[PDB]
Enzyme design. Structure first.
Site, mmCIF file in Angstrom:
data_model
loop_
_atom_site.group_PDB
_atom_site.id
_atom_site.type_symbol
_atom_site.label_atom_id
_atom_site.label_comp_id
_atom_site.label_asym_id
_atom_site.label_seq_id
_atom_site.Cartn_x
_atom_site.Cartn_y
_atom_site.Cartn_z
ATOM 1 N N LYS A 13 -14.153 21.802 124.961
ATOM 2 C CA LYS A 13 -14.662 21.316 126.242
ATOM 3 C C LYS A 13 -14.759 22.438 127.277
ATOM 4 O O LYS A 13 -15.791 22.591 127.937
ATOM 5 C CB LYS A 13 -13.791 20.169 126.749
ATOM 6 C CG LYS A 13 -13.751 18.979 125.776
ATOM 7 C CD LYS A 13 -12.937 17.804 126.315
ATOM 8 C CE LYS A 13 -11.498 18.196 126.603
ATOM 9 N NZ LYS A 13 -10.780 18.648 125.401
ATOM 10 N N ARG A 88 -7.766 10.878 131.087
ATOM 11 C CA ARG A 88 -7.083 11.145 129.836
ATOM 12 C C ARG A 88 -6.357 9.917 129.295
ATOM 13 O O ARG A 88 -5.874 9.953 128.157
ATOM 14 C CB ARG A 88 -6.113 12.322 130.047
ATOM 15 C CG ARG A 88 -5.272 12.787 128.888
ATOM 16 C CD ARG A 88 -5.856 13.960 128.106
ATOM 17 N NE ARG A 88 -6.297 15.139 128.841
ATOM 18 C CZ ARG A 88 -6.175 16.393 128.389
ATOM 19 N NH1 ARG A 88 -5.573 16.640 127.232
ATOM 20 N NH2 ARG A 88 -6.641 17.410 129.106
ATOM 21 N N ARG A 123 -7.806 31.915 119.643
ATOM 22 C CA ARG A 123 -8.151 31.747 121.046
ATOM 23 C C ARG A 123 -7.530 32.857 121.885
ATOM 24 O O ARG A 123 -6.399 33.275 121.637
ATOM 25 C CB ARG A 123 -7.677 30.392 121.563
ATOM 26 C CG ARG A 123 -7.939 30.230 123.045
ATOM 27 C CD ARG A 123 -8.008 28.797 123.450
ATOM 28 N NE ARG A 123 -6.725 28.125 123.334
ATOM 29 C CZ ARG A 123 -6.577 26.824 123.552
ATOM 30 N NH1 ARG A 123 -7.637 26.097 123.889
ATOM 31 N NH2 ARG A 123 -5.392 26.251 123.427
ATOM 32 N N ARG A 156 -1.903 32.152 125.009
ATOM 33 C CA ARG A 156 -0.925 31.205 125.514
ATOM 34 C C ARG A 156 0.204 31.026 124.510
ATOM 35 O O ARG A 156 -0.026 30.958 123.301
ATOM 36 C CB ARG A 156 -1.592 29.865 125.794
ATOM 37 C CG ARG A 156 -2.773 29.957 126.733
ATOM 38 C CD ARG A 156 -2.904 28.684 127.555
ATOM 39 N NE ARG A 156 -4.088 27.903 127.200
ATOM 40 C CZ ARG A 156 -5.155 27.785 127.983
ATOM 41 N NH1 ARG A 156 -5.179 28.406 129.160
ATOM 42 N NH2 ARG A 156 -6.197 27.055 127.593
ATOM 43 N N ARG A 167 -0.100 17.782 120.655
ATOM 44 C CA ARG A 167 -1.156 17.359 121.571
ATOM 45 C C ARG A 167 -2.156 16.449 120.870
ATOM 46 O O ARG A 167 -2.680 15.504 121.474
ATOM 47 C CB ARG A 167 -1.879 18.569 122.149
ATOM 48 C CG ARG A 167 -1.042 19.361 123.131
ATOM 49 C CD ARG A 167 -1.926 20.206 124.035
ATOM 50 N NE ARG A 167 -2.472 21.383 123.369
ATOM 51 C CZ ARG A 167 -1.817 22.534 123.216
ATOM 52 N NH1 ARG A 167 -0.572 22.664 123.670
ATOM 53 N NH2 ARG A 167 -2.401 23.562 122.612
HETATM 54 N N1 LIG Z 1 -18.315 25.463 118.821
HETATM 55 C C1 LIG Z 1 -17.157 26.303 118.604
HETATM 56 N N2 LIG Z 1 -17.065 26.877 117.407
HETATM 57 C C2 LIG Z 1 -16.006 27.667 117.119
HETATM 58 N N3 LIG Z 1 -15.053 27.893 118.064
HETATM 59 C C3 LIG Z 1 -15.148 27.318 119.284
HETATM 60 C C4 LIG Z 1 -16.191 26.527 119.578
HETATM 61 N N4 LIG Z 1 -16.038 26.095 120.855
HETATM 62 C C5 LIG Z 1 -14.887 26.633 121.336
HETATM 63 N N5 LIG Z 1 -14.346 27.393 120.363
HETATM 64 C C6 LIG Z 1 -13.094 28.133 120.517
HETATM 65 O O1 LIG Z 1 -11.875 27.154 120.113
HETATM 66 C C7 LIG Z 1 -10.900 27.305 120.994
HETATM 67 C C8 LIG Z 1 -10.680 26.042 121.875
HETATM 68 O O2 LIG Z 1 -11.797 25.937 122.714
HETATM 69 P P1 LIG Z 1 -11.635 25.381 124.233
HETATM 70 O O3 LIG Z 1 -12.920 25.546 124.995
HETATM 71 O O4 LIG Z 1 -10.440 25.990 124.933
HETATM 72 O O5 LIG Z 1 -11.374 23.813 123.894
HETATM 73 P P2 LIG Z 1 -10.745 22.728 124.913
HETATM 74 O O6 LIG Z 1 -11.391 21.443 124.416
HETATM 75 O O7 LIG Z 1 -11.045 23.046 126.363
HETATM 76 O O8 LIG Z 1 -9.190 22.678 124.457
HETATM 77 P P3 LIG Z 1 -7.832 22.874 125.305
HETATM 78 O O9 LIG Z 1 -6.929 23.670 124.395
HETATM 79 O O10 LIG Z 1 -8.059 23.602 126.603
HETATM 80 O O11 LIG Z 1 -7.326 21.322 125.559
HETATM 81 P P4 LIG Z 1 -5.780 20.935 125.968
HETATM 82 O O12 LIG Z 1 -5.594 19.448 126.181
HETATM 83 O O13 LIG Z 1 -4.818 21.433 124.904
HETATM 84 O O14 LIG Z 1 -5.582 21.755 127.374
HETATM 85 P P5 LIG Z 1 -5.670 21.165 128.904
HETATM 86 O O15 LIG Z 1 -5.665 22.424 129.735
HETATM 87 O O16 LIG Z 1 -6.863 20.318 129.198
HETATM 88 O O17 LIG Z 1 -4.281 20.337 129.127
HETATM 89 C C9 LIG Z 1 -3.082 20.996 128.816
HETATM 90 C C10 LIG Z 1 -1.922 20.024 129.147
HETATM 91 O O18 LIG Z 1 -1.977 19.682 130.429
HETATM 92 C C11 LIG Z 1 -1.539 18.130 130.489
HETATM 93 N N6 LIG Z 1 -2.738 17.460 130.987
HETATM 94 C C12 LIG Z 1 -3.956 17.937 131.216
HETATM 95 N N7 LIG Z 1 -4.722 16.951 131.701
HETATM 96 C C13 LIG Z 1 -3.948 15.862 131.802
HETATM 97 C C14 LIG Z 1 -4.237 14.595 132.243
HETATM 98 N N8 LIG Z 1 -5.518 14.135 132.727
HETATM 99 N N9 LIG Z 1 -3.306 13.641 132.256
HETATM 100 C C15 LIG Z 1 -2.053 13.951 131.828
HETATM 101 N N10 LIG Z 1 -1.763 15.208 131.392
HETATM 102 C C16 LIG Z 1 -2.723 16.162 131.371
HETATM 103 C C17 LIG Z 1 -1.192 17.798 129.253
HETATM 104 O O19 LIG Z 1 0.252 18.141 128.990
HETATM 105 C C18 LIG Z 1 -2.077 18.703 128.367
HETATM 106 O O20 LIG Z 1 -1.597 18.806 127.091
HETATM 107 C C19 LIG Z 1 -11.318 28.501 121.872
HETATM 108 O O21 LIG Z 1 -10.747 29.612 121.335
HETATM 109 C C20 LIG Z 1 -12.856 28.553 121.750
HETATM 110 O O22 LIG Z 1 -13.361 29.944 121.969
#
Ligand SMILES: Nc1ncnc2c1ncn2[C@@H]1O[C@H](COP(=O)(O)OP(=O)(O)OP(=O)(O)OP(=O)(O)OP(=O)(O)OC[C@H]2O[C@@H](n3cnc4c(N)ncnc43)[C@H](O)[C@@H]2O)[C@@H](O)[C@H]1O
Ligand SMILES: [Mg+2]
Lengths: 214, 88
Positions: A13, A88, A123, A156, A167
């Protein structure tokens, strides 16, 4: 223009958010980035959120809703915005509907869990901005350095396979019900819904989303 | 017509599962909605708008099923579908 990105954590995303930002002139709103800033602050609640994030679990609904409502009231969000990782849970989505926050598109990223676990291995991030690269599938122009600042890239420590899988378990229990939630909204005419195959290379996922959007 | 898929067919099968294929409609497809049931509650699932195949499993052998494919323009079942009947 208002857009929600839906999908499993690690489906890509944030990667695609950057292209959507660059082309419609709207800010990215990442609740994960907002929570990481809260951790780096150093409040007791920031500490509490870091402990929850380290265990791969979700932070409480009411906290994140309040952070989003404050963020979307700012001047840079007037012309619209892109929600990345929010809502979420169903209560988070209901809070948006009850507050009258309508959106134009809900975009679902379809990626299997075992491919996600594979991808996170490579990543790399630019910590201050949160920009995301992959050493094979989306590498920086010159190795290990952010593309438009030149500062170093990092990995990270919450990207241990173990935390990734926690997750993903949280996602299927708490977050995947939003697919049915917004499919019903779309059938009612309250937003458009789309489902993209996120297993393709980065450039092809971008091309499929360009086809959908306008 | 530009929003209705064509040439829906079963292209592979086992006694309890099958693969369907179709020719995509002319419009940009946001996602597909696929339903199936005995020709009993109807089951439904989705695939990305870029696909033109889908797997269905859990079928009772020797039973007639109606399988229906909608191409969505974003608002759920907003375009007319194509269907097929198939005995496993
Ligand atoms: N087409 C493709 N082909 C090949 N490779 C590709 C590709 N596209 C991308 N890639 C690569 O693959 C990798 C991933 O791509 P990337 O673009 O980083 O994917 P992403 O979907 O953004 O995944 P995240 O790891 O950021 O999601 P997350 O939930 O773990 O983190 P968040 O910060 O939102 O949340 C973190 C924490 O915050 C809390 N949190 C966040 N939001 C909430 C909420 N609304 N409510 C409650 N808790 C929350 C939770 O504890 C959560 O766990 C990259 O290396 C990329 O280069
Ligand atoms: Mg992200």
């Amino acid at each position: 223009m208002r857009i929600i990105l839906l999908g499993a954590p690690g489906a890509g995303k944030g990667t695609q958010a950057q292209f959507i930002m660059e082309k419609y002139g709207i800010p990215q709103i990442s609740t994960g980035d907002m929570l990481r800033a809260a951790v780096k602050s150093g409040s007791e609640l920031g500490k509490q959120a870091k402990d929850i994030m380290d265990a791969g679990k979700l932070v409480t609904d009411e906290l994140v809703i309040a952070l989003v409502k404050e963020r979307i009231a700012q001047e840079d969000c007037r012309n619209g915005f892109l929600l990345d990782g929010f809502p979420r849970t169903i209560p988070q989505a209901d809070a948006m509907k009850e507050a009258g926050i309508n959106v134009d598109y809900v975009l679902e990223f379809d990626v299997p869990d075992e491919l996600i676990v594979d991808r996170i291995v490579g990543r790399r991030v630019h910590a201050p901005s949160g920009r995301v690269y992959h050493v094979k599938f989306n590498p920086p122009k010159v190795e290990g350095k952010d593309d438009v600042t030149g500062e170093e890239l990092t990995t990270r420590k919450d990207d241990q396979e173990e935390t990734v899988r926690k997750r993903l378990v949280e996602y299927h229990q708490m977050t995947a019900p939003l697919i049915g939630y917004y499919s019903k909204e779309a059938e009612a005419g309250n937003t458009k819904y789309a489902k993209v195959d996120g297993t393709k290379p980065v450039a092809e996922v971008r091309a499929d989303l360009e086809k959908i959007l306008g | 017509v530009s929003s209705v898929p064509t040439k829906l067919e079963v292209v592979a099968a086992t006694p309890t599962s099958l693969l369907i294929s179709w020719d995509a409609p002319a419009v940009t497809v946001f996602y597909y909605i696929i339903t199936y049931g005995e020709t009993s509650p109807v089951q439904e699932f989705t695939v990305p708008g870029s696909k033109s195949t889908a797997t269905i499993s859990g079928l009772s052998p020797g039973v007639d099923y109606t399988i229906t494919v909608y191409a969505s323009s974003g608002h759920g079942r907003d375009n007319s579908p194509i269907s097929i009947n198939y005995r496993t």
